[PDB]
Design a protein around this ligand. Structure first.
Ligand SMILES: [Ca+2]
Lengths: 219, 97
């Protein structure tokens, strides 16, 4: 073991794709990553937001993540946390940084649809005509992948579709108006914003990365 | 698939067999491209992912590769996501957080 990943503040991994049934097993979502980071001295905490839908609102994932962060802070004696979120988890992490800036040291987003997902939009459109969405091979293959990533459920079809509602262009548009961040570039520019942000009297380090395996071709 | 290609995989890539999310995410990513998303990971476009200091958007990854998924299977051209996250945690450490 060593101290390569031994940050000053605890690291909270925040999943995005989750089921609608609270307390599902999320230990393998960040596959092999918790043990790797622990071997390098990190204090890793994996949030479980399964059972909560949207990020904002009194019973959204944001208030749940905030409560989890306060629990980690009360237990450790630490004053702040580093939030690393994947997919929706990046939006959930932004909620906590906005409503409780003094508890956050950094926000890192991985594959987060800050401006929405065109696949979520496509599914919204298809559901107006086929409410199950299973007539579409592309939707059915996604549903099956979702099912394999999360713990067993009798209702994978429903949960996989539910997972995309928060990620539409329209939903995320409202979210960004409600929860602005200097980390976001101007709408329609396809550019990032600032590397840091001052929210209360707190400075936040802001980061992100994404994958571009799927490229457009003429054929 | 029409209108898109998956750069994470090489010729006769076993990831197309053992991890069903590889081809599924190419199909969802093609739907996104027909909706003006541009390059993407299957669920999220490069443009939509941009926030704060962008370390990179050039990884040859689909959405599940980012979390070393399914069960750590990734195409032949995909970078190691475990090492990428590890490097970032050290980055945070060296930034004083
Ligand atoms: Ca994979």
């Amino acid at each position: 073991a060593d101290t390569y990943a031994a940050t000053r503040y605890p690291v909270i991994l925040v999943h995005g794709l989750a089921g609608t049934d609270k307390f599902a097993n999320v230990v393998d979502y960040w596959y092999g990553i918790q043990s790797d980071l622990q071997s390098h001295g990190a204090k890793v905490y994996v949030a479980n937001l399964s059972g909560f839908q949207s990020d904002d609102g009194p019973n959204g994932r944001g208030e749940q993540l905030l409560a989890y962060v306060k629990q980690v802070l009360a237990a450790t004696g630490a004053t702040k946390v580093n939030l690393i979120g994947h997919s929706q988890g990046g939006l959930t992490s932004r909620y906590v940084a906005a409503v409780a800036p003094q508890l956050v040291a950094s926000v890192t987003t991985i594959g987060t649809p800050h401006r929405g997902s065109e696949f979520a939009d496509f599914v919204q459109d298809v559901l107006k005509t086929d409410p199950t969405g299973l007539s579409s091979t592309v939707i059915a293959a996604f549903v099956n992948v979702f099912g394999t990533l999360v713990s067993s459920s009798h209702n994978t079809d429903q949960d996989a579709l539910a997972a995309l509602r928060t990620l539409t262009t329209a939903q995320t548009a409202t979210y960004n108006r409600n929860f602005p961040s200097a980390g976001l570039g101007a709408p329609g520019s396809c550019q990032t914003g600032a590397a840091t942000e001052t929210v209360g009297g707190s400075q936040h380090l802001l980061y992100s990365w994404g994958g571009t395996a799927i490229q457009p071709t003429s054929t | 698939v029409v209108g898109a290609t998956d750069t994470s995989t090489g010729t006769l890539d076993v990831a197309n067999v053992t991890d069903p999310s590889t081809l599924a995410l190419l199909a969802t990513g093609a739907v996104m491209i027909n909706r003006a998303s541009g390059q993407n990971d299957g669920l999220v476009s490069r443009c939509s992912s941009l926030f704060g200091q962008v370390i990179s958007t050039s990884y040859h990854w689909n959405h599940l590769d980012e979390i070393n998924q399914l069960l750590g299977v990734r195409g032949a051209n995909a970078e190691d996501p475990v090492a990428v996250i590890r490097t970032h945690v050290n980055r945070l450490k060296l930034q004083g957080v």
